[PDB]
Amino acid sequence: RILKIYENKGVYKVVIGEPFPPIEFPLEQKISSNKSLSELGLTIVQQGNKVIVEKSLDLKEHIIGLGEKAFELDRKRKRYVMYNVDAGAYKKYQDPLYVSIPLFISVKDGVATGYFFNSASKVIFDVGLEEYDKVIVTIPEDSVEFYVIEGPRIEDVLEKYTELTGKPFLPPMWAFGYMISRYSYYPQDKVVELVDIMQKEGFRVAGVFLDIHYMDSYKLFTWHPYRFPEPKKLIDELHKRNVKLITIVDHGIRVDQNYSPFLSGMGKFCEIESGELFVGKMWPGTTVYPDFFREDTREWWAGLISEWLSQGVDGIWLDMNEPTDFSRAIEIRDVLSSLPVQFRDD
Amino acid sequence: ILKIYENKGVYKVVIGEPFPPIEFPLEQKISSNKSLSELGLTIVQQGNKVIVEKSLDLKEHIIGLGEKAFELDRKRKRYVMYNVDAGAYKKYQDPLYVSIPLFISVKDGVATGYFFNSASKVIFDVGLEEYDKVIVTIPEDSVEFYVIEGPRIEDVLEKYTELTGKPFLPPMWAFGYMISRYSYYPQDKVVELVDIMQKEGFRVAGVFLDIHYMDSYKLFTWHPYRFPEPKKLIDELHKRNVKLITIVDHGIRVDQNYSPFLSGMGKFCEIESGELFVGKMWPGTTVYPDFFREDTREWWAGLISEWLSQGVDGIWLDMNEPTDFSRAIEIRDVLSSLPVQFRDDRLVTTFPDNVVHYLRGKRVKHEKVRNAYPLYEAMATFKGFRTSHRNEIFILSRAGYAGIQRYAFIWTGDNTPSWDDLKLQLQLVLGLSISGVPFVGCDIGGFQGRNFAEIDNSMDLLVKYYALALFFPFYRSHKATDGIDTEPVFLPDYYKEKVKEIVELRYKFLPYIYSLALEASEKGHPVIRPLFYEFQDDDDMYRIEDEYMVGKYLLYAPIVSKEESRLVTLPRGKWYNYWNGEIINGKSVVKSTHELPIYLREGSIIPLEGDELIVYGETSFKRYDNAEITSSSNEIKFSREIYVSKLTITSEKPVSKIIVDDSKEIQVEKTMQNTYVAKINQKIRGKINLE
Amino acid sequence: ILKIYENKGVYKVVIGEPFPPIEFPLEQKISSNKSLSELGLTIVQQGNKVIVEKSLDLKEHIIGLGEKAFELDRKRKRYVMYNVDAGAYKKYQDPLYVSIPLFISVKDGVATGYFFNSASKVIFDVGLEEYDKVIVTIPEDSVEFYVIEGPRIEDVLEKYTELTGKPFLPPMWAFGYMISRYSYYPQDKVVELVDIMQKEGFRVAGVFLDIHYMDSYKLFTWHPYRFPEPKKLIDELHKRNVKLITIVDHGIRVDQNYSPFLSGMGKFCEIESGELFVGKMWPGTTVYPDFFREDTREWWAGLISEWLSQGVDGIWLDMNEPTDFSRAIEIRDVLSSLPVQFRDDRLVTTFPDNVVHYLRGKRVKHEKVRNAYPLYEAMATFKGFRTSHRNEIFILSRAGYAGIQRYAFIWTGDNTPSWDDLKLQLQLVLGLSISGVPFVGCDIGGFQGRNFAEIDNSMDLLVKYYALALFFPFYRSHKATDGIDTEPVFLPDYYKEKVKEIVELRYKFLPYIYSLALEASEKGHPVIRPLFYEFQDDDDMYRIEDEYMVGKYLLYAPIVSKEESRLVTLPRGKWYNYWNGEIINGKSVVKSTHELPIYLREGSIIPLEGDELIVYGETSFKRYDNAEITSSSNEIKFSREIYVSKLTITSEKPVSKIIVDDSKEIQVEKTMQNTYVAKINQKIRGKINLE
Secondary structure, three states: OOEEEEEEOOEEEEEEOOOOOOOOOOOOOOEEOOOOOOOOOEEEEEEOOEEEEEEEOOOOOEEEEOOOOOOOOOOOOEEEEEOOOOOOOOOOOOOOOOOOOOEEEEEEOOEEEEEEEOOOOOEEEEEOOOOOOEEEEEEOOOOEEEEEEEOOOHHHHHHHHHHHHOOOOOOOHHHHOEEEEEOOOOOHHHHHHHHHHHHHOOOOEEEEEEOHHHOEOOEOOOOOOOOOOOHHHHHHHHHHOOOEEEEEEOOOEEOOOOOHHHHHHOOOEOEOOOOOEOEEEEOOEEEEOEOOOOHHHHHHHHHHHHHHHOOOOOEEEEOOOOOOOOHHHHHHHHHHOOOOOOEOOO | OEEEEEOOOEEEEEEOOOOOOOOOOOOOOEEOOOOOOOOOEEEEEEOOEEEEEEEOOOOOEEEEOOOOOOOOOOOOEEEEEOOOOOOOOOOOOOOOOEEOOEEEEEEOOEEEEEEEOOOOOEEEEEOOOOOOEEEEEEOOOOEEEEEEEOOOHHHHHHHHHHHHOOOOOOOHHHHOEEEEEOOOOOHHHHHHHHHHHHHOOOOEEEEEEOHHHOEOOEOOOOOOOOOOOHHHHHHHHHHOOOEEEEEEOOOEEOOOOOHHHHHHOOOEOEEOOOOEOEEEEOOEEEEOEOOOOHHHHHHHHHHHHHHHOOOOOEEEEOOOOOOOOHHHHHHHHHOOOOOEOOOOOHHHHOOOOOEEEEEOOEEEEHHHHHHHHHHHHHHHHHHHHHHOOOOOOOEEEOOEEOOHHHOOEEEOOOOOOOHHHHHHHHHHHHHHHOOOOOOEEOEEOOOOOOOOOOOOOOHHHHHHHHHHOOOOOOEEEOOOOOOOOOOHHHOOHHHHHHHHHHHHHHHHHHHHHHHHHHHHHHHOOOOEEOHHHHOOOOHHHHHOOOOEEEOOOEEEOOOOOOOOOOEEEEOOOEEEEOOOOOEEEOOEEEEOOOOOOEEEEOOEEEEEOOOEEEEEOOEEEEOOOOOEEEEOOOEEEEOOOEEEEEEEEEOOOOOOEEEEOOOOEEEOEEEEOOEEEEEEEEEEOOEEEEO | OEEEEEEOOEEEEEEOOOOOOOOOOOOOOEEOOOOOOOOOEEEEEEOOEEEEEEEOOOOOEEEEOOOOOOOOOOOOEEEEEOOOOOOOOOOOOOOOOEEOOEEEEEEOOEEEEEEEOOOOOEEEEEOOOOOOEEEEEEOOOOEEEEEEEOOOHHHHHHHHHHHHOOOOOOOHHHHOEEEEEOOOOOHHHHHHHHHHHHHOOOOEEEEEEOHHHOEOOEOOOOOOOOOOOHHHHHHHHHHOOOEEEEEEOOOEEOOOOOHHHHHHOOOEOEEOOOOEOEEEEOOEEEEOEOOOOHHHHHHHHHHHHHHHOOOOOEEEEOOOOOOOOHHHHHHHHHOOOOOOOOOOOHHHHOOOOOEEEEEOOEEEEHHHHHHHHHHHHHHHHHHHHHHOOOOOOOEEEOOEEOOHHHOOEEEOOOOOOOHHHHHHHHHHHHHHHOOOOOOEEOEEOOOOOOOOOOOOOOHHHHHHHHHHOOOOOOEEEOOOOOOOOOOHHHOOHHHHHHHHHHHHHHHHHHHHHHHHHHHHHHHOOOOEEOHHHHOOOOHHHHHOOOOEEEOOOEEEOOOOOOOOOOEEEEOOOEEEEOOOOOEEEOOEEEEOOOOOOEEEEOOEEEEEHHHEEEEEOOEEEEOOOOOEEEEOOOEEEEOOOEEEEEEEEEOOOOOOEEEEOOOOEEEOEEEEOOEEEEEEEEEEOOEEEEO
16 A cells, blocks of 8 residues: 655645556656645545545535536536547436546635546546545546645636646637538538638638548548549638638548558557457448557657648547447447347447 | 115215225215116126226316326326336326326216225226226226215315325424435535525425435434434434434345344235245345235334334335336346347336235235335324324325325425426326325425436526425425535525525415315315316316416416416406405406416415415405404404404405404505505404404 | 475465365474475466466376266366256266365376365366366465375375365165155155055165155145145154155245244345345245354254154255256246247356355355355254264265265266266266265166156166166165156066166175275275276276276176177276176276176175175275174184175185184085185184185
């Protein structure tokens, strides 16, 4: 059992065991803290490959955060699951969704305090559900590092939290303009025709998004030979009309013998426990996925992106990157397709 | 074999040799000469079934059948009478938790009741199978039913109540504002919430403790960590004038060291083959007490009495359909893997077919007496209060059968918050009310929390729930574990104030409500009533369901939409707009003028909080404290000396003054159209004359 | 953590901090001075698992593992040790009812034993995963096992028996001819059958009563209509000198008025969550006694003792794997409608994973101690006999674990009659025998009746079953309810006579068999033995499975084919053909000359019924009554005065006469080659000399 607490400019870094963070966050001026878990109002328990962190919850206490949740802003009375998932045609009160920000802020007596658990696993935030007077956080790992971020203002917590995890990049002003998109706009001449009508009728269009129909058989970094024969012409036309072009880019690399990205990416794809490549299903059909956790895979991908950008593409729209895979679903469909039964959408 | 008896306008028809779920006393069984044809009935005995037929005319109205998620006029539907855990029920779902095999027919303005005393899966086919017929199917080879003569709907209910039992008289606090949740804990949080509620101006009569207070859901136990000091909790709540109502299920955990399991041995339900019926419920593996047996009832009364002796004020009986989860869990274990969606068959939650009971010493199948299970459990629980020499009795039950009114209040179960639910709840509580169960209500704010998308937790809807139930006998706010906090103290000031005023208004009218409760326990008259109860001769009244009568005098048309006003249908006669004093002529449609459309009918006397009094027209009324008030042309008589604070007199003719007992003359002030007020603030020995 | 102790050729290896299913006493255990590598073992502790590895050479033999439906040399298979109701088991099916986690390695003629004292799902991968390795996986984070030095296989078993417990000494009648069925009833039919059997010349030692004698399968009850007079049935059988053995299952019916259920309360098995483990067995809904507890064992001993006091002579423990049918029945209730075939999974009949027990005060999961359940039930049952002051003990068990030999006989369960089964049964009983469980047998005639096509009920096969089991310790005929009547008295004269002679021959050899039983209870030597037990240095012996040794002197090669004679493999040394007197040189293959291929090895002494005595060569032998007989050159000594009827002497050298105690002379008669008989009919103070 290991428990170390560090402090630094209003941020307490609590270390349970020997954590292996999804990503490491720089905490420069970190110095050993004399603050105890008890003064911090926290209780910790290490069990079967799990860490449970408890905090009390008062009747008037407010709990906010947890990112993208289809629930009321004050999170009380619910057990939230932090696990990126393709939510489909999501409805309210559906959980989890596409994004997982393991951060919640407590506002007690007007004072805000943040709690950030740096684990990208299936973290559970039980906010006054299991125990009406408690916030119970379960991290499915034997070790974990989390942060108690002092306020007192909610803005103070976010400033410190942002300092810790990274400042938002500064995008260009046109990124906040009016964007038109569809799944999908094509062929290329129709894209320009629509932009013209929009502009002619008084709509200031900052950019147009191109969905998966622009690709050749949904293959990343390719142009459909019939719908987009002249990408250079398309791009010049949009730029002459001062309109940006944003292209969707998925994460699936088609398992194709003559598909360049598949051949150049070899060696940098995700694998399964037994050693083979993880082969799944996505838009392109049979697909493999780049292991973005590796520095070299990231380099290979940046190159692909850079090259794609050099044509004059202005933005990148990353989709299905939960990451999502359809092999299991298609598998169920292939075996029980005959049965006049209704599958449960899990 | 057919035998017909008659007595005080009640015909008891016996087919074959019936073995009733329960026996109802007949003052004097006198043989009758009336024939089935004179009663307009046809009877057929078939394969272990009895089919009773009655004609059904186009204008004939059929009401009753208790708790049904349908329009009050029951025509064009085949109803099933079988207690079942309805889950997150929606409208038009059948059957539900309660089964009252009683329906009333109103033909040519004349009411006649039909009560089939069978707790089996009785089928009421109301003009569905045969457009011109009401076909009742009892799945037993024998049966006893009653034809209850009217002519008024009230006459039928009086006779029916006389037959099955008068509603017990609960304490006044049972009609107060109750807060509840699934669940409130630990104990300190319970007290903290009560304090905030009281500190912010909410008069809380009692708090309900749901299953989280138990130790592993074991009945009659306190959770060792959440409720370490029950005596302290109880003292604290009482110290704050708050009653404590604890939920009590029907499942006894099959536990080697669980006292109730060991002491109850020998009194549990069995299956055909002789073993105990072992099922699944909150505690896990469980057995169930056979409440049809006297010794079991006595054993339970003792456990209840023991539980009440700590200072617990009320018992909340839940899951007593009776419900069991062994079959559902069973299906889930085998097809757990399979990526398929199951059909939610509610009947799967009932007791399996091989369960048996011992009724009056005779061994009988569960399916023949099922619906009466909650009746007997409530009976045993009531006996528990008697054993504790407890005069103030409060028992809430989810399920029921004819006669349940003798022992308990009934709430509409796990409703889903939504605008449509406002109308549904009205149909449910009125359905129960017109069927002999007076003390009813629904969960204010809706039970369902956030486990599915179709749940509306908006605050204006919550306010409308509080407003809807304004005059319901049972006024409780309850919410599922994952639901947002619905206590008024957590609402923004704007909405908090609205709830606060509504609750204060309910307490202002509490004396009237409780007086009607007394009336219910004495005559069997329901407290809240559908309009056709008071105006059964007007066919239009059978289509009005978003309005209800409170007692015989008050009409309430709750706003069940997002509008600021609504159209209000007024029955024949004159109606006094409680809020602006305007007197409108009945049998018309008007637009409401206040957020709470309240009207008093000519010929009303309403007792208000603080000994206030409102008199309009001539009528005779009995207050909850037995004081009778009779108003006439220009005189108000009192059966005994009573103190009177403010007196409000609605009158189209000007009132200049009143004289108390032919001596002290009091000045009257006209506060608004047709409204005259008089500060009396004194005891009135016997009468008041108006001038 | 690793610790190794040693004592008298036994190394106790302790990994981590083990919590044994049962603790075996180790006398003067001293810290060992032999490392793991010197023991040729490799150990690895992983995810709650301990893996022990040993090398495996091409010529190395691996025997043991108890009841396995495989060849005696266990190589090339991954065995699972988990008691399970195997159903209508076929060959190569694994696992079965009994789990003895012991295997013996014979390398270069030297035997070494390996006993892993874990009653969990131990895996013995014998050269399957790794061709040159024996990998043992214990699903626990800790474990204690023993390396038992030989060098003889007999040495290993002696030490192993010393460690886990000497076989109890049963009465001689326990080895007699037993008739049984599922089931014999009513009581008058039981006596009628016994009379016909005795009248026709069959000496019946006892009759077994199956579950039909109980009232609704309730333990310790008599069926009110089939067995109205149990006391009369008992006296009738005893008057005929026939013992009564009653089956007793492990399921306690969950019945409100069933005494054992009420008195056992508090001592039943539970599930992790705290409730009682409620399952399904013959009685229907049932609970099971937690035999791992001392108080449960005393409670059970009391019921057994009480049951024995009526005059019941033996207890037949069945379904004690332990088996439960709740899962299997659950699947049928849910997938009943589907016209598909369920995959027959025998593991579904074990206790579910959430069942827990209290072993030595510690709460443990069923899967960790499962296999020892029958051991503890047998222990409690044995205690029941002690409580009754019953010295003649007879207990039959279906399941078992190391140490089960202390308390019970074991039969091979529900076998299917067929010619192939003859060989299978031999492997099964020899597997048990070489693994420390001496008193074993199979159902003569096969258990399965006629519920499937692959059942051979031919009469000549039935005769071969009787012949096959001729020298098995347990000799019982048992049949399923729908099977044809297999009692000899229902056979045509031709076959009836054959069975009669075989049974008479068994009784003729009973004194020898019982003497070996005494040997088993004193030294832990098995009664029937595979040939490699006596000739472990000859690799050929590990492939001979249709032959077995009875004690150390008799070799029996039963005819398990349709042929009239078979080939018989004879081990090294000289062998005497019991029927024709021919003496053949060992390590050869000869053709049988009789239906019952029997041979005596040079150096044998065999006590026969009626004080007969056969002596061939030089050797020493303790008769069951303690009388020791030593034969030398031309002299036979006796440890004490004993009576001798007929004396048969086999010798290649002519014998003309014998002298009794140096005085009296008796004429000898050469009946056949190498065979000389002498009718002594008198007591012999100390010796006999031959001239």
